[model samples]
Structure formats: structure tokens, C-alpha cells
Target: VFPSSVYVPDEWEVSREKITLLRELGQGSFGMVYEGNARDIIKGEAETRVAVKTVNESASLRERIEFLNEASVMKGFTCHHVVRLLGVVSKGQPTLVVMELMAHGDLKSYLRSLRPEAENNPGRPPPTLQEMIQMAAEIADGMAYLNAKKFVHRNLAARNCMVAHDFTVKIGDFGPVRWMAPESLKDGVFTTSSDMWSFGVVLWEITSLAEQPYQGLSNEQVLKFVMDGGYLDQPDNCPERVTDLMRMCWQFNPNMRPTFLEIVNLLKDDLHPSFPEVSFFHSEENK
Candidate 1:
């Protein structure tokens, strides 16, 4: 039998009095997101700004549970590239999930902002190839950390990642579902390997400057294409090395995909190809 109460860890809870809702950031099937401030009543602490996610009161019990479960997963994580969970107001009228406010916004939008003909932007500079590679590396690093913690970020996509004011790439909006892997899409079994497959799609988004994947193909068509051993055509202007890494992640066999750690290593080496190799001569001379 299921328990009556959801067991949200104590550390994850935040006082409702502390948060001040500022403005609506966005809305989705889960709920509305607002930009807000978290205040510290005590003497020494300064007030902090945050992104607050409020579950729609009319949402089903299952939806609330899934949302809380996502919060539970994030509470246990502390990594540079993963979104940091500030706290949650689980007992309130509209349950709030508080997180660090990423100033720049989602990666897809960030990439789109860089486009030459993009709407409503003036004097936006194009990202250098190095910056693009670094963004991918940061994402891989975050996924590696999540894998180390035994968590599968089932929703790994550009839309789910955010960019900071300093141009840091962070994984975010990682709630219950959507943007699934081929295996998960098929058997509903999500694993690290499946996450890797999603990561490959994300790579395409970055390389393509936020273009939608599988454009002109319906959802059913996409599923059929992948099931029949079809893969995404590499985006134009994507570096060959980056394209290769993405292909590695999208392998049909789950076992064929590199682990997130391996992906991180590959990105590290590829991003810094000129780094000095191990040298026996230097070692011997020092000896």
C-alpha cells in the first residue's frame, strides 16, 4: 500500500514567508514559474533572488508527486553545471519549488539570440566555436556528475538547460518527462545510456544554434525513423569532431554509447587538442 504522506526531506523545505513572487517567468503543463526573491529574516543573511515553480492546485495527485520527486532528485545534487535547488514549500496551498535564477535563460533561447536574423535583438555577438565547445563540455560535465550520483536525467535537451549571466551552461527544467531516449520512448525504461541518446539530440541543438530537431517530421515519424536505424543529419557548420561525439552518443545499441564520464573525457581532450601529451623524455631528463 502507498503511504499517506509524501516524504519530502527536511533540508529541501523552505519557509513560505521567505519568498516574494516577482513576475511570471513561464508556464507549462506542470505549472507556472515565477521570478522571485527569497528573504532572510535573521540578521546576517542577505535576501536572494530565485526562480519559483508553483504547481497548479488543480493538478492531479500523481502530477504533484512526480513534481516533488523531481525536486527530491535535485535536492541531493550540488554541481557547477546542474541547476541548484534553493528550497521547496511543499505544505503550502500551491507548492513551490525554488531554484537559483539563471539570468540569461534556457540554452535554446540563448542560442537563438545569437542568430544573425533573430528577432528583437540588436548588437548580439555570435558565439565563437570555442564558446560552443565549452558549452557542450559544461553540459557533459553536469551529466557526468549526475551519473556519478546514480541519477538519470531523463529529460536531457537544450530546452532543459539554462545559461547564466557569465555564459555558464547549466542543466535545468529537468522535471518528470519529455525529450526521452529511444529506449525509454520504446520500452519506458530509462537508464544512463538513454540519457546519453537525449544528450546527442541536445548536441544537435547546440550545433544547429537552437533549431528544432527532426523538423518536418511528426512524432510518430521520428520514432519510426530511429527504430529503423536512422539518425539525425549533422547540422551545417557543426565541427566534425563535435558531430562525431554526438554520433557516439546516438548509437542504436545502448551498450555502444559512452558513459557520461567517458563523454566528459572525450570533450576535455577534444576541446584542448593542443594540450601537451605525456613525455618520457621530460620525465627522464628530470630524473
Candidate 2:
């Protein structure tokens, strides 16, 4: 069975006074994350690290609806493989989406830390094929759960995944999550196919340590290019096996994209290896 640690319960409520703000954890254009208390009070130093995402006041009604929908999903799901939502506090001016404090940062930072030596060494210190496979497997498990819930994670980038101590992974960042309610998939807006589209981009980022999919395209141009039959060109150095899976995911027509279950199966051989030995680049002094 996959390893997991129980962090938060399936249903929990936000207690304003109990949780005290700690330091910042991470942030995005629309919000900022912070390490904070779980219950807001001092309960015998019962430390429960949390991430507070401050919603932008400028967010429109539609955007707010999206955000709230994601929160509802979080409330419904309480699995070790997925990031747990503690609660949300909106009594103040700006609402904060409280989540379990992810000790290790996102997948991008984790990968960057994995091979710091490669920056100056010309080639990556040959990471064990098993390590790469483990990461992908853990992520697929989380994605499979999301798909089973009928929620399409419209943005599944490397940064959306958080690694915990012992290299365990928890899928996070639900801002782009959309519910595939009955009849919603074919609305020509958000679909499971689009989720696969984002997943392909994520796979590229993981295997390449977050390289831009297309080097010289702006965001708008990238979108247009992708919609116009353009997809990522795998790096010359990328493994043939990995590239093959990515090409299938980046297909222009959403219908042509493999289902989440199919993608998982296709990569099963490459991802079923036993866990390998690994090390952290950052230590107390270095960090």
C-alpha cells in the first residue's frame, strides 16, 4: 500500500481566535500562504502548521465562486494523499483559506534541491530511475482520487504538489479545480480533457524541473499555440519513455487525450519500481 500520514479530518471548521499567524509558507499572484496555528489558541504547544491563503479582494464574483467550489471539494476529501483543508476564515476584510502546513515546499523546489550539484556539474547526478518513478506514482495516485471524485484539476503543475518529510507527496492548490457536474464536461469550458492537458504540462515540468513548455511563447501565445495544435517539444536529453507519455498527454484535441486511468496504466511499468535511496540537499545550516 502507498504510505500516508493522517494530517486533518474529513470535516473541520475554522476557529478564528484559536489560530495565530505564523510565518509565510508560499504565495501566488492571487493569494499568499502563511504558517499558522490550527485552532488559534495555545493548546500546550500543540503545533499544527497551517497555510493561510489570502483571497484577493479584486477577485470577481465568478472567480469567488470557483474558489468556494474548490473549498467545498477540500472539505469533502480527507485522504493522506491529498492536502487537507483546515478551514476558511472570512470574518475579516480579506478571507483566508487555511490548510495543513506543508513542511516541504512544492515539487519544483524539491526537484531543484534534488540536484543542486547539477547546476555546476554540467550533467545531473544520475538520479535513480526508481526515485523518479516513485514521485510520478504518488502524483498519479492523487490525481486518480481527484478524477474519481468527478473533480477535474484544471491546473496540475509541478508547483501544485507538496512534498512532506520522507518524500511523501500531497496534492495541493485547488484554485483551478472545477467540478465536472453532470453535463458540465461538454460545456466547452472546463473538461476532464482540459485536466489532462494540464497534467501533461505538469509531467513536462516534473521531468524537466519546470522548464517552460515552449521557450519563446508568451502566455497568450502559448495558449493559442496549444489550442492551434502546438504541444511541447521534449528536450533532447529527456528519456524516450518519458517523452512518449508526454506526447500522448499533450494532444491538441481534448478527446484524443488519454483518460486519467489510461495514462496511469500506460506509465505503470515505468512507475512501479521499488522506492530508492535519496537525500535532501538542504540541511539546517544550508537552509
Candidate 3:
């Protein structure tokens, strides 16, 4: 059910006093995420770490609707790569959307932390090429499920996704015109095809190690350029195989874009490292 305001199940609601906000993880126009501890919301006695999504007490009706709507949607999904909604605290003001905490944080922040200039992080070093491709495939696998369910992820991007344990990346967070397809951006036509377009850009993000897409171009410029058949240029480190795949997703006609199923197959076979290693850079002219 695509609802602006959702009917949250009673069992899903927990006592507000049971939750302890630890630290601010991140914030966006919609809400703020806090590293919180929940008392026995999932298990007995053992406090569980969770990401708490809360809105301002002064928020308007529409904001509350959208917030509750997010919780409702997350509760319906069951995929390893998708973030899970554990519970909620919607009794009154400071409505909370409780979720499984992604300890490593969002993919974009994690990638940025790995840049050489940053402080020495004792955590996992940069991912290998094989690992990176695996991350992309995981997203496609998760998205494949969504596509089958006829759910269009209006928001899909690296920054919006969180990094989980065991080098896993869990997809979450939704929104923004930058990650939108030309058709959707122009006519509000959202489909899995448009999501494919956004996924292509996320692949670009992985290849570039989290640099912003279309860095110089304003949102206005990106809209016109993409609608006029323009797409991202190959990032310096992008492989030829992957670049071709991204280009296919950016096809002017949404119908021509590959489905998530097809993307999964291609990524697992050709782009996957077990197949064989190719040049990191697939330049036209042989050096």
C-alpha cells in the first residue's frame, strides 16, 4: 500500500522510555538518525543497538505522514541487503522509527573515511576490486527482489545506503533529484528503470571511491543534460565492462534499460573478479 500515512501494527510499538539515544549518526530534511540503545525490543533483557529515526516535535502533518510511511514500508521488506525496521515509538511527540543499527555507517561516509589523507582508521582498509564488485552485486540482488515486488525505490544512491558488518552494504535512505532518471526528473515518471539509472550512478560512486557525481554541474544543469541524452562520463578507475553496463541503464528510453535481474546476472559473471582480472582502466587506445 502506497500510503502517505500508515497504520503501524500495535506489536511494533515499544515504550519510549526503553530507548536511549547515544549519538547523532546523521540527519536529513526528513529526520535525524541517532545511535540508540533499545531495551529488549527484540530480545530479552539484552539491550540492542539500533538506529533511531526521529522527527522534530514541531513537525507538520505531512512530515509525520512521510515519516510513518517510511517505517511502514521498511516493515514490509525482508532482504539481507535492505535495512530492517525493528520497532517504533509512536505514542506521541518525538515519533521514532527504530531500525537495525549499521555499525559501519553509510557507504559514502565509509568511503570518504578511507581516503589517504584521512586519519589512520584501524578499521578495514580499502576494499579490493573483487569486494567492490560484490558490493554492487549485493545491491542489485536486493533491488532485484524489490523489482519483483513491484516496489520502486525512489531513492537509491551510495550516500543513502549503509555499510553493514562483514563488508555488507544495506540499502536504505531515500530521495533527491540527482539520483533520479531523466524521465522521472522531467515528468515524475518513477519506475524500476529509473532506479536502474540511479544504480548506475551508485556504481560510478563505488568506482570513484565516493566522489560526488556531476561535481561541477548544478541540479538544474544535470536535469537538462540527462534529459537531452547525456549521462556520466567514465570515472578514471571504472572498468570498461562496468561502464558499458551503466551506459545501458542510462538509455534515453526507459524501456531499453536492463532490468535488475539482467544486471545481477552480468555483474556476477563478467564483472565479478572470479571470472578473470582485466585492466582497471579500460581505455580505447592501448598504452
Better of 1 and 2 by lDDT: 1
Q: Per-residue lDDT for 1-287 in model 1, tens only?
A: 33244546596678898899999989844899999889863247698778898788788787787777777767676776787888888875687888888888888888888888888554767666777777777787777777777777788888889988777788786532225566776788889898888888888888888887888888888877777777889988778878998899888889999987676666565454331231111122212
All candidates' TM-scores? 0.82, 0.68, 0.83
Relative to the true structure, candidate 3 reaches a TM of 0.83
Q: After superposition, how far is residue 283 of candidate 2 from its true place, in Å?
A: 36
Scanning candidate 3 in windows of ten residues, the lowest lDDT window is 278-287
* CA error at residue 138 for candidate 3, angstroms: 1.6
lDDT winner between 1 and 3, please give it.
3
RMSD of each: 6.5, 9.9, 7.6
Candidate 3 per-residue lDDT, tens place, 1-287, comes to: 43356756678888999999999987855678899999998867589999898887677888787888778777776666677888988888788888988898888888878766658554666666677777777787677767765688888988888887655776776536678899998999999999999999888888777888888999989889888888888888677767887898889899999987777677656454432222111212112
Q: What's the residue-level lDDT of 279 in candidate 1?
A: 17
How far in Å is the alpha carbon of 159 misplaced in model 1? 0.8
Off by over 4 Å in 3: 1-9, 119-125, 175-177, 269-287
